[PDB]
Coordinates of N, CA, C and O in Angstrom, one line a residue:
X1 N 0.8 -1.2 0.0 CA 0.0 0.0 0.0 C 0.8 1.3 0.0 O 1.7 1.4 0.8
X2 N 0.6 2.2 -0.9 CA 1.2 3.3 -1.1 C 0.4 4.2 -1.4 O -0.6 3.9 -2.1
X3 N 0.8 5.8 -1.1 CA -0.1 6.7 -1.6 C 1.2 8.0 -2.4 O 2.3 8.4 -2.0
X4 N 0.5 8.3 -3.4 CA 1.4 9.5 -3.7 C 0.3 11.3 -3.3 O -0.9 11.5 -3.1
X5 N 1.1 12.2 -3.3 CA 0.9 13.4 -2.8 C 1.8 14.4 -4.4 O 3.0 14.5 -4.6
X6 N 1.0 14.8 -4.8 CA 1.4 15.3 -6.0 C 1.6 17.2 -5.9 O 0.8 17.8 -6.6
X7 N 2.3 17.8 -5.4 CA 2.4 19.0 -5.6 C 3.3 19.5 -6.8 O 4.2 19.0 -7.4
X8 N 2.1 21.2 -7.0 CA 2.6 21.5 -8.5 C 2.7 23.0 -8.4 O 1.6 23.6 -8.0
X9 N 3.7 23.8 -8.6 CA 3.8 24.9 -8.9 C 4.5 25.2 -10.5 O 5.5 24.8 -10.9
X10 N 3.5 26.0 -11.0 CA 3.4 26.1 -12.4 C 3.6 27.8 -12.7 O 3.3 28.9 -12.2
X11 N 4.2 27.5 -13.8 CA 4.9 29.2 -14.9 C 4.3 28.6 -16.2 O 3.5 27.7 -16.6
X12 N 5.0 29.5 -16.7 CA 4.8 29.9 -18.4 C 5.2 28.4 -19.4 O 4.6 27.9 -20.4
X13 N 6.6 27.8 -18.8 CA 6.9 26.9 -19.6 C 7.5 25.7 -18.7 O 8.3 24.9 -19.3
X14 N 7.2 25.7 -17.6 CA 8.3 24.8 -16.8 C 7.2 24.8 -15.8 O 6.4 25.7 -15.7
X15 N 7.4 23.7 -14.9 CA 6.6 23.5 -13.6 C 7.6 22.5 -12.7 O 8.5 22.0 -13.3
X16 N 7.4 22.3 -11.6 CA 7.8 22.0 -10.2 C 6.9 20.8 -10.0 O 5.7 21.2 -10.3
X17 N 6.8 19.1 -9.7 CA 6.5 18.8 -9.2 C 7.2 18.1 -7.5 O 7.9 17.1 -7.5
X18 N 6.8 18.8 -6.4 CA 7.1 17.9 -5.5 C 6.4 17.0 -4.7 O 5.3 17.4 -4.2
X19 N 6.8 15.8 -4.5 CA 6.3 14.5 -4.7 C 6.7 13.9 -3.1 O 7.8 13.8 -2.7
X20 N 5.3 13.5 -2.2 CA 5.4 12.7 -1.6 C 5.0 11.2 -1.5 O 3.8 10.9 -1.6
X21 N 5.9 10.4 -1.4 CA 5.5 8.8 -1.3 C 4.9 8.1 0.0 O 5.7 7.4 0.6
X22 N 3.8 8.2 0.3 CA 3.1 7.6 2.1 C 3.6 6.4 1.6 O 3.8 5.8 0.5
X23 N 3.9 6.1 3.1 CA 4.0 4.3 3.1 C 2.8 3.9 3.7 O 3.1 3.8 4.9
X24 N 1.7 3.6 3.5 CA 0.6 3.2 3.8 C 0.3 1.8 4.3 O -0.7 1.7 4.9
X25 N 1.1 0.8 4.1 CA 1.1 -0.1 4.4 C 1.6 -0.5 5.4 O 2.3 0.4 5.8
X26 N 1.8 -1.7 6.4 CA 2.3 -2.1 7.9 C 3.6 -2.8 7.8 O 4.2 -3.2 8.8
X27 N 4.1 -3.1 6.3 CA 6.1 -3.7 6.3 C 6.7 -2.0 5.8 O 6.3 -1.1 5.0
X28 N 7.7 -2.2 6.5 CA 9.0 -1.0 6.0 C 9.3 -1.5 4.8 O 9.1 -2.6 4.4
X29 N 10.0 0.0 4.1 CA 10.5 0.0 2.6 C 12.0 0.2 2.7 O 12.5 1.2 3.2
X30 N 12.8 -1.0 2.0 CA 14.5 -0.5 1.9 C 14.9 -0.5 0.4 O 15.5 -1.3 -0.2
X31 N 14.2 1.1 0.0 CA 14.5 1.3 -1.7 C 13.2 0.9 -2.4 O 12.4 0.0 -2.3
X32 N 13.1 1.9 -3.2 CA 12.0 2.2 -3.7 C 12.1 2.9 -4.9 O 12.9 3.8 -5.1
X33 N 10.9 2.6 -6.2 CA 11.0 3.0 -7.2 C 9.6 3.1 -7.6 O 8.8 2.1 -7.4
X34 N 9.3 4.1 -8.1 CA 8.0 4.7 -8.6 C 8.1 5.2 -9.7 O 8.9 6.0 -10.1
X35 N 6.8 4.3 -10.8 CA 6.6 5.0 -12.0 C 5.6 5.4 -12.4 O 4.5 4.9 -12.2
X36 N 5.9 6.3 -13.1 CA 3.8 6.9 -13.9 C 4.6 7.2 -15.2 O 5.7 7.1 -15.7
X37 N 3.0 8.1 -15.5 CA 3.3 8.5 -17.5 C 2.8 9.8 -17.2 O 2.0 10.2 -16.4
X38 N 3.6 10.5 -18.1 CA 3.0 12.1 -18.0 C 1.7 12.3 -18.9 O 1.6 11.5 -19.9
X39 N 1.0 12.9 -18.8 CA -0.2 12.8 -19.8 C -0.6 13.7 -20.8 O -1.6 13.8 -21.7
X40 N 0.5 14.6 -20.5 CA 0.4 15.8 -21.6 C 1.7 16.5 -22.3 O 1.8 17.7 -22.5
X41 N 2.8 15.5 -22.8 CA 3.9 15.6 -23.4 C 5.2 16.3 -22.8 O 6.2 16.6 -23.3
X42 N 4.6 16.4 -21.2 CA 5.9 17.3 -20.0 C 7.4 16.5 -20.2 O 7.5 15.3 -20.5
X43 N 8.5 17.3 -19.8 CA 9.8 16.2 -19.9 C 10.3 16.9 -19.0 O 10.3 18.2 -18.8
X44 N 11.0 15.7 -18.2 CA 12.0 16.3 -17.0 C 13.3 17.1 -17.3 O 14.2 17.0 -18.1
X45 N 13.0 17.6 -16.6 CA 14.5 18.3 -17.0 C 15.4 18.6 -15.9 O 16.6 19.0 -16.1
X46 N 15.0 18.5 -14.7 CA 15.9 18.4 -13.4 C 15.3 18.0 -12.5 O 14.2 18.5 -12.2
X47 N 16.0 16.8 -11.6 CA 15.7 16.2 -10.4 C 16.6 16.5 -9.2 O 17.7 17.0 -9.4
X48 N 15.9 16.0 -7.8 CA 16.8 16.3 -7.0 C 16.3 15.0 -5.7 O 15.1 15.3 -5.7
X49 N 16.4 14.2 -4.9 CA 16.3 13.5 -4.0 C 15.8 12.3 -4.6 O 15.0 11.5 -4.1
X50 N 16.2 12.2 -5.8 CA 16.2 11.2 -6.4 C 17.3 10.8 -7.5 O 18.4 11.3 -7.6
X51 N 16.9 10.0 -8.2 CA 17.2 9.7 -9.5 C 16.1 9.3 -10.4 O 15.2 8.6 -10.0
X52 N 16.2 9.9 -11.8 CA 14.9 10.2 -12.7 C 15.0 9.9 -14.2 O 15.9 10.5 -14.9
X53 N 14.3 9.1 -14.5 CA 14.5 8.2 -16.3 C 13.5 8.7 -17.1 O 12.3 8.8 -16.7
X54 N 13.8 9.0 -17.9 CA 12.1 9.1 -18.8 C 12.6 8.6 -20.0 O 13.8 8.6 -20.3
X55 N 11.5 8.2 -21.0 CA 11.4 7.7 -21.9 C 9.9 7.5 -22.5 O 8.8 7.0 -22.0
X56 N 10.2 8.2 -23.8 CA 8.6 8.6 -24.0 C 7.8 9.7 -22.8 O 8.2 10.8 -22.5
X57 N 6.9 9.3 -22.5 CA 5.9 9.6 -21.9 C 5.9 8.8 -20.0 O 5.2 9.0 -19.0
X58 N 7.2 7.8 -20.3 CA 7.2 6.8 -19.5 C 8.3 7.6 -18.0 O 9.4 8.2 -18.4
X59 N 8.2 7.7 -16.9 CA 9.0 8.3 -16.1 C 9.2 7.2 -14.8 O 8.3 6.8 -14.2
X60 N 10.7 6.7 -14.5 CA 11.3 6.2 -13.2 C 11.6 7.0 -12.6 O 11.9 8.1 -13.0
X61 N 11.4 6.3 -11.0 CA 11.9 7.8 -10.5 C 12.9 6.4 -9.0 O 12.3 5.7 -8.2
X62 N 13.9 6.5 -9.1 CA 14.7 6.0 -8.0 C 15.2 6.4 -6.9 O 16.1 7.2 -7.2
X63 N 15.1 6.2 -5.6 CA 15.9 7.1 -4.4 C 16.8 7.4 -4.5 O 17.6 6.9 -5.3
X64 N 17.1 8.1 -3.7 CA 18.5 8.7 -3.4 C 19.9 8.3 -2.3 O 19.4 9.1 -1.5
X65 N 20.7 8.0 -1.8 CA 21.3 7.1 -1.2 C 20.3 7.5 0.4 O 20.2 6.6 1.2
X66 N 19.8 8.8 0.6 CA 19.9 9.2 2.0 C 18.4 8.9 2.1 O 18.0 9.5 3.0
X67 N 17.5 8.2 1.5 CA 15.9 8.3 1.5 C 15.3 7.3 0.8 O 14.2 7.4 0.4
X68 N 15.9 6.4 0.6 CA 15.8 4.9 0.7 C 14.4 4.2 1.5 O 13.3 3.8 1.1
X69 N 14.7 4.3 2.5 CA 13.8 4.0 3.9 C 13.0 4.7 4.5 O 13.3 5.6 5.2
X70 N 11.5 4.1 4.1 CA 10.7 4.3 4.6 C 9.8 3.5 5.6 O 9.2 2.5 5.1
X71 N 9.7 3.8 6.4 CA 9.2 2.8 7.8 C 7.9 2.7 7.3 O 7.7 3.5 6.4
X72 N 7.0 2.1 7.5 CA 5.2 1.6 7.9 C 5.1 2.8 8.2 O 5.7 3.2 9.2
X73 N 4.2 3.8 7.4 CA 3.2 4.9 8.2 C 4.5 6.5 7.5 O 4.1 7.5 6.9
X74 N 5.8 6.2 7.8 CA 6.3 7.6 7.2 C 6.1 7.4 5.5 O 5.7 6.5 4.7
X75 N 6.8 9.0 5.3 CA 7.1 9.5 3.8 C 8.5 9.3 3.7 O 9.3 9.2 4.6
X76 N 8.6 9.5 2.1 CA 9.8 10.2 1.8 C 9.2 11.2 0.4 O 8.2 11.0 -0.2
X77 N 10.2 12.7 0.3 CA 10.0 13.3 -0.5 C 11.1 13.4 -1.7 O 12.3 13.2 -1.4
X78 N 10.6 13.8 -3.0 CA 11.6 14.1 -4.1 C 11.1 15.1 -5.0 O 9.9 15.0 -5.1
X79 N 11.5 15.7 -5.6 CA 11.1 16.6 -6.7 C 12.0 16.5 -7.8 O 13.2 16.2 -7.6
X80 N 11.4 16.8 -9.2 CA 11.6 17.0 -10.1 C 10.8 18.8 -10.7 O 9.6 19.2 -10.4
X81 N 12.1 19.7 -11.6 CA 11.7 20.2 -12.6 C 11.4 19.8 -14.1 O 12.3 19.0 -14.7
X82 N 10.0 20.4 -14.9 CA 9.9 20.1 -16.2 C 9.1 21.3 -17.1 O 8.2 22.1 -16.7
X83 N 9.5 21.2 -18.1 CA 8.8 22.0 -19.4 C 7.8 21.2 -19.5 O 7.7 20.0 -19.3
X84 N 6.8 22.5 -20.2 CA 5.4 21.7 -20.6 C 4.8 22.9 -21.7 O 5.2 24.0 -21.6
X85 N 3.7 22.7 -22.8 CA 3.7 22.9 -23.4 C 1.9 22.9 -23.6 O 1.3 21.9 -23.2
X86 N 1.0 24.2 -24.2 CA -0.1 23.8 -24.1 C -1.1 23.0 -23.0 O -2.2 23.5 -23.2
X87 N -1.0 22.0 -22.1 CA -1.6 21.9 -21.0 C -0.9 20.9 -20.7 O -0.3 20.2 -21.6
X88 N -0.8 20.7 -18.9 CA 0.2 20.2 -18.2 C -0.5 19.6 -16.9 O -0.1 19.9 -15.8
X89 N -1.8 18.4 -17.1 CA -2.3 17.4 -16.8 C -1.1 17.3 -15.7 O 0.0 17.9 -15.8
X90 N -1.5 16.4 -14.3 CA -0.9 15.6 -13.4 C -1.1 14.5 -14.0 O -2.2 14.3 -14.6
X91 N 0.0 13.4 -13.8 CA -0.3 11.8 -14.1 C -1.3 11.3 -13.1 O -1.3 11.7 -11.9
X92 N -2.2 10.3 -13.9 CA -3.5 10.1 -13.1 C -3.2 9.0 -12.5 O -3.9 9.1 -11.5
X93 N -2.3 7.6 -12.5 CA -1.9 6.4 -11.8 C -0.4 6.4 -11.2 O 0.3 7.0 -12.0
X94 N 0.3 5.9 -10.1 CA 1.6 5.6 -9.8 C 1.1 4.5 -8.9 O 0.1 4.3 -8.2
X95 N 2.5 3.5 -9.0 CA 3.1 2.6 -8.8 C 4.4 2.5 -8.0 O 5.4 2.9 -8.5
X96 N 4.4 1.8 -6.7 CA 6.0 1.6 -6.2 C 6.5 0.5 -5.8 O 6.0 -0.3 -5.0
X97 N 7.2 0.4 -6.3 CA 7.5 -1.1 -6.4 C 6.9 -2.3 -6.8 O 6.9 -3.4 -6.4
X98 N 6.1 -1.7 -7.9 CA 4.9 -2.8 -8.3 C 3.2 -2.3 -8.1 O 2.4 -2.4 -9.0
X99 N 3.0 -1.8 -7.2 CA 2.4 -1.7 -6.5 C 1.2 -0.5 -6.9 O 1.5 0.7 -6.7
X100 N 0.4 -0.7 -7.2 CA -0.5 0.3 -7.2 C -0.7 1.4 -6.2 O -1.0 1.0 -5.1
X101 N -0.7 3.0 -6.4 CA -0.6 3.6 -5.6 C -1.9 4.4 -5.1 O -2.5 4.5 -6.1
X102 N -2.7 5.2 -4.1 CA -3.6 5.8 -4.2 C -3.1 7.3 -4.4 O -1.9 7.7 -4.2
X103 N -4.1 8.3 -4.9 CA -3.8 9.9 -4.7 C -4.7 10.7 -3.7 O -5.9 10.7 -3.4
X104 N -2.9 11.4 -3.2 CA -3.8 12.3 -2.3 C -4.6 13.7 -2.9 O -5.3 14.4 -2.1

């Protein structure tokens, strides 16, 4: 069980997403990877408390050595910057580690 928390601060051509991962479920997490799809042709262009893949429309997003671990019940946070073009949709599904996620 996981939940994501999607914050967005938005301009003219580039937006901010920072991104919380709940651990919602009752086992601890050692490493973790979360993916979604952007839904409106956005591309990353800078990460930070992570590490971040895209391809296509397709986005990885991998921890960072210091935020790996998440106990039962905490978060961890990461953000990425991206350009966007014409409208700039939030991704509607995420996954961590498999796992279907809910939104906050």
């Amino acid at each position: 069980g996981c939940q994501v928390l999607w914050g967005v601060n938005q301009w003219n051509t580039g937006f901010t997403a920072n991104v919380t991962v709940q651990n919602t479920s009752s086992a601890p997490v050692q490493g973790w990877t979360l993916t979604f799809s952007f839904p409106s042709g956005q591309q990353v262009t800078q990460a930070w408390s992570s590490t971040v893949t895209q391809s296509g429309s397709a986005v990885t997003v991998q921890n960072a050595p210091w935020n790996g671990s998440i106990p039962a019940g905490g978060t961890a946070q990461f953000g990425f910057n991206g350009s966007w073009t014409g409208t700039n949709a939030a991704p509607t599904a995420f996954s961590l580690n498999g796992t279907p996620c809910t939104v906050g």
